[PDB]
Design a protein around this nucleic acid. Structure first.
Lengths: 148, 296, 95, 146, 82, 22, 184
RNA sequence: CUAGUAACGGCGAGUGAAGCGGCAACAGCUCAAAUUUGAAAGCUGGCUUCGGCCCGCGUUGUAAUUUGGAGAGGAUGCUUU
RNA sequence: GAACGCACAUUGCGCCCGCCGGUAUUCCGGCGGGCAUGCCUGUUCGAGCGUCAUUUCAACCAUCAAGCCCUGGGCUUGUGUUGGGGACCCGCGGCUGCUCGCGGGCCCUGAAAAGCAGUGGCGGGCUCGCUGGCGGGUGCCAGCCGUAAAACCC
């Protein structure tokens, strides 16, 4: 499921600095001598929290190794409250590679291009059938212990 | 550090950044140029030109063998093509200036001795044949020898061509070289006893003979017109044997035109060695050949 | 391309740098059509084919050929050529 | 030691018979397997039943392959309880479901020559079905002959 | 965004999540040096409202101070000693 | 017998879930 | 350990190859190429892991099993049908004179008594063949290029060529020269 | 100046302010708590032919907008560089 | 001297990069430039039973060819479909018939799903008989065909 989600999110990666300057130079020389809204993976903790609260996010992927874990403990409950499907992924460095940064505490996808909307929908259903109900009973229970 | 960066870009999934980093690396398989800049080391090691010729002996020997050697991971194909082009440009220099003096062939191959600025250079070429590299051999130090001697022979070629006034690098077109022009691919334009041997005669070499060495010898001493078969190469005279213009035809076989004279490459070699025109009757085909000598 | 000898001045060779000696000139024994005095006997050729390589004072024997097409190419060329390369960089030079 | 029957649904096109047997044979030994297929056209109904010899390995396979996103299909791997197993459920197990051209048979039966009296049955069937159709279209009114 | 939630969490310091996290961190800090460089703030909402910026030139430094009196009380605060 | 089948099933489940590489 | 997506991918490739083989077998094997016999180099590339029986039989008849193997093949109707069968695994086209010359001079080996020797001497190739008219290596060079009756024995004599793996260097008529240029 | 006043005190020694009023001088601001999200738009270094090129910091938040006698967003029509 | 290569009460004793003079690539002497600590930014090197990723789930039919006819307009061949359900209208094959097949027209459903599987052969495979050869059974065929027999295989 992480492989499927990262296939979709690799389809919707943002642009690096080189591609952005290259594109801007292209528009500059085109003006010297028409577009739709860009669709990218949304990142940044405060930005993603604002997207979840306004019910704009469609799928939320939360890293599991945020060292100040307070920055993300309320995030599964927040996604549950506002109704956005979420999943916990292994590695903030993995989410970082996707957004061209060293790390990323959380990423979110809000809307996509037409040609893979169905795929996104299936992925959403996948996590809400493959991760959310396997977590549903153990999300409430205390963990750990040395009983035995 | 740049290898670390390109490995980082490959592991990060950035194909475009990987392309940018490998463009910046100048890795010597897509270019053929030596990987590092070796101007200052060869400047400090060789202060003048005759030491460059003295080491160019071994440098040019290495490069001729390497041009007749195949390609592996440690020795790619593009700088082998550069070896071929640079050796052929050097041969064009020799056939323009007639700097070649002595030529002795053998079961090694052929050694050639040429004088440049009063300095003798001896260099050996093997035959056009499959060479086995069996045994324990290291090819990385081979590649180091390669890029070192591309640096030396390129700078020696540029210095010598500026000394003689010929422009460098002389142009060659890819169409006729891809048809097999070999020594006829490179065009040289003058501004940006050897000559009396084969001054005005007509030469043709047949389908059996090694085309490269006898063409090198014939053009080295100013023979005006040398032709060969259509399958041996491209960019020559008429390949028909019925043409009466050709006087001497080099054959070695186990037509018979009366005006045409049938000779063997041993006759060419002894005429080059002795400078006295050893006779074609004594070196006629179909008979046991009298011995020659190594003039060194 | 820019000229390497743009500002050329003579430089005295310091005595510590010992240049590598040049290769010997080709002798009379290494022609493939040698005089009949130079031809070894067939027993000598068999004895040469018998004992081990690199145990020889001389690495070549002359062989008579009638044409250039009859002359083959010896492949250990590369290796012996390879051999002399580490000579000039791993056999030290004594003045 | 009782066998464990496993219901696998939402099959992708490709995960049919030998791929199922191999992939769940990595999970443990399979006694039997059957993919339900259509009568008229040989084609899977995206549904299969696999019988393993060991019930625990069947539970393990069904648990860890249940909501598997395979080729845009989220699988349905559920263990059929031992009390609800139908008796002749693996009737066509370990057999090929051959694709048979029924319509080509019908056409070449239409080509096939009947000899002398089956054409009399032909025209008899033609005439009283024409009579019934004539009653039906005389209910509304449309005359015919011949 | 998230800093509002972290401020509300920091206002419940005996709740289960915050008590658990405070104890685990206290154990680690006790076994470190008295004054040690912190890579990032453990309380980013608190550091951010006090003027910390994720910019070159800003440094966090964690410090432990022995608590208690100096019945002469030290009129200097433990936070000032830190 | 049964223990070997259970161990093989658990190994296959771990290979299916957590993967094979490392 | 092998996962289910590999099984379904394998099955999809095998099915697509099966319909494609049925399509070429049903349709009359006439290429859009003049009836004159030509000469094409064929180099087979990695593609589908599992080979159907008719493609593996044709590849064995064209002796292409090992890594990066190349063989010259005539162009008539039967050979056109054979190479149209095994299109997804092979890449073919018209070679050049320098291509075949350099390719046999760098990598030219011979097969006799079921064993593979390097071309070392012209006496070796003359002992190997003897009497069909070939007398040297340039002879089989222009026998490969210029058409003649001695194709089959010469092609059976030569081992096919184990070209070195490239680092990044359908049907086309001239880009194959750059391919073997980078393949060597 | 208030004022040795209020207040506190072996109510002893005594201790001891401040508001208002008159004057001198006057000046106001920056952040955190917001999603730029139709585009980290921000910054330290190194290389320089000094014009623009690389590495890095940073999304666990660097610019712009805003600071509660406020403000934002739309609309609107004037007025400012 | 905060005093900063070490000591300091000695004009003493070390490390790294260079030079000069006196028998001098080896010996001696002198000289020039550097070598303290805490901390910040960057660079580079290195550790960690801290930690993640590493067995294509992609594209690939013809983006037009070939042949006709009156050389200007078309024609023909290029066989390529997820599975179910419905309170309907038919047609044609079968059956003594109910009914069942094949093909249509009208709807509904997430790439949805909980037995109902039955039509005859040819080859190959497995199995067991007779003295490599001869015969039959098969819920085997990721092999063909449609009952008449092939193709394929070697």
């Amino acid at each position: 499921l992480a492989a499927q989600a990262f296939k979709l999110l690799n389809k919707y990666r943002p642009e690096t600095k080189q591609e952005k300057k290259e594109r801007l130079l292209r528009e500059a020389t085109a003006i010297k001598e028409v577009s739709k809204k860009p669709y990218t993976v949304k990142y940044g903790l405060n930005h993603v929290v604002g997207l979840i609260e306004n019910k704009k996010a469609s799928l939320v992927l939360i890293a599991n190794d945020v060292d100040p874990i307070e920055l993300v403990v309320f995030l599964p409950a927040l996604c549950r409250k506002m109704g956005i499907p979420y999943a916990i992924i292994k590695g903030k460095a993995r989410l970082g590679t996707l957004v061209h940064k060293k790390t990323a505490a959380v990423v979110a996808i809000t809307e996509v291009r037409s040609e893979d909307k169905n795929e996104l929908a299936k992925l959403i259903s996948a996590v809400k059938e493959g991760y959310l109900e396997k977590v549903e009973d153990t999300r409430k229970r205390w963990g750990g212990g040395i009983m035995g | 550090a740049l290898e670390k960066k390109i490995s980082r870009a490959l592991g990060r999934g950035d194909v475009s950044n990987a392309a940018r980093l490998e463009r910046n690396a100048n890795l010597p398989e897509k270019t053929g140029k030596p990987r590092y800049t070796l101007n200052h080391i060869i400047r400090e090691r060789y202060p003048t030109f005759q030491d460059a010729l003295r080491d160019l002996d071994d440098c040019l020997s290495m490069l001729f063998l390497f041009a007749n050697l195949p390609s592996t991971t440690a020795v790619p194909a593009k700088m082998i093509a550069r070896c071929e082009r640079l050796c052929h440009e050097f041969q064009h220099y020799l056939i323009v200036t007639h700097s070649l003096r002595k030529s002795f062939l053998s079961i090694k191959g052929i050694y050639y001795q040429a004088n440049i600025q009063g300095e003798d250079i001896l260099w050996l070429v093997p035959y056009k044949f499959n060479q086995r590299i069996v045994g324990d051999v290291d090819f990385r130090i081979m590649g180091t020898f390669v890029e070192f001697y591309m640096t030396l022979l390129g700078f020696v070629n540029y210095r010598l061509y500026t000394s003689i006034g010929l422009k460098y690098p002389p142009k060659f077109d890819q169409v006729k070289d891809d048809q097999g022009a070999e020594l006829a691919a490179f065009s040289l334009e003058g501004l940006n006893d050897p000559s009396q041997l084969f001054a005005n005669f007509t030469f043709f070499l047949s389908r059996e003979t090694p085309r490269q060495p006898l063409e090198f010898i014939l053009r080295a001493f100013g023979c005006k017109r040398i032709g060969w078969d259509a399958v041996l190469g491209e960019g020559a005279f008429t390949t028909d044997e019925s043409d009466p213009r050709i006087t001497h035809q080099i054959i070695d076989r186990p037509g018979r035109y009366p005006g045409r004279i049938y000779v063997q490459p041993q006759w060419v070699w002894d005429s080059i060695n002795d400078e006295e025109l050893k006779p074609p009757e004594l070196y006629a085909p179909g008979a046991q050949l009298p011995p020659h000598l190594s003039p060194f | 391309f820019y000229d390497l000898w743009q500002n050329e001045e003579p430089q005295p060779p310091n005595p510590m740098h010992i240049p590598a000696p040049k290769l010997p000139p080709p002798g009379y024994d290494l022609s493939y059509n040698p005089p009949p005095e130079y031809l070894p006997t067939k027993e000598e050729r068999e004895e040469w084919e018998k004992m081990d390589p690199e145990d020889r004072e001389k690495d070549y024997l002359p062989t008579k050929y009638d044409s250039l097409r009859k002359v083959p190419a010896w492949g250990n060329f590369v290796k012996e050529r390879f051999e002399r390369c580490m000579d000039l960089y791993l056999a030290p030079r004594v003045r | 030691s009782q066998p464990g029957v496993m219901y696998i649904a939402r099959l992708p096109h490709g995960f049919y018979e030998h791929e199922l047997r191999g992939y769940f044979s990595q999970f443990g030994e399979i006694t039997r397997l059957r993919v339900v297929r259509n009568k008229k056209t040989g084609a899977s109904r995206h549904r299969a039943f696999i019988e393993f010899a060991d019930a625990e390995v069947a539970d393990i396979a069904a648990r860890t392959m249940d909501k598997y996103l395979l080729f845009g299909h989220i699988l349905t791997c559920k263990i059929v309880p031992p009390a609800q197993v139908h008796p002749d459920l693996f009737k066509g197990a370990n057999r090929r479901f051959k694709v048979v051209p029924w319509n080509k048979m019908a056409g070449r039966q239409l080509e096939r020559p009947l000899s002398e009296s089956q054409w009399q049955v032909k025209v008899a069937k033609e005439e009283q079905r024409r009579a019934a159709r004539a009653e039906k279209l005389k209910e509304m009114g449309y005359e015919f002959e011949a | 965004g998230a800093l509002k939630y972290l401020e509300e969490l920091s206002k419940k310091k005996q709740s289960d999540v915050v008590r658990f996290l405070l104890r685990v961190r206290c154990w680690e800090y006790r076994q470190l040096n008295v004054i040690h460089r912190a890579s990032r703030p453990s309380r980013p909402d608190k550091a951010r409202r006090l003027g910390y910026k994720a910019k070159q030139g800003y440094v966090i430094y964690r410090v432990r101070v022995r608590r208690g009196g100096r019945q002469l009380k030290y009129q200097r605060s433990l936070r000032a000693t830190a | 017998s049964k223990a070997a089948k259970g161990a093989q099933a658990k190994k296959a489940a771990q290979a299916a879930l957590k993967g094979v590489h490392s | 350990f092998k996962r289910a997506e590999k099984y379904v991918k394998e099955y999809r490739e095998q099915e697509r190859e099966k319909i494609r083989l049925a399509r070429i077998a049903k349709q009359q094997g006439s290429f859009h190429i003049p009836a004159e016999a030509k000469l094409v180099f064929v180099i087979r590339i990695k593609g589908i892991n599992k080979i159907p029986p008719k493609p593996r039989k044709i590849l064995q008849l064209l002796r292409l099993r090992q890594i990066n193997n190349g063989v010259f093949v005539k162009v008539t109707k039967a050979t056109a049908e054979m190479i149209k069968i095994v299109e997804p695994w092979v890449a073919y086209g018209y070679p050049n004179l320098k291509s075949v010359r350099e390719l046999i001079y760098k990598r030219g080996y011979g097969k006799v008594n079921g064993q593979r020797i390097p071309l070392t001497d012209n006496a070796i190739i003359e002992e190997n063949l003897g009497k069909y008219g070939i007398i040297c290596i340039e002879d089989l060079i222009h026998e490969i290029f210029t058409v003649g009756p001695n194709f089959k024995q010469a092609a059976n004599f030569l081992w096919p060529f184990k070209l070195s793996n490239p680092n990044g260097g359908g049907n086309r008529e001239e880009h194959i020269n750059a391919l073997i240029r980078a393949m060597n």
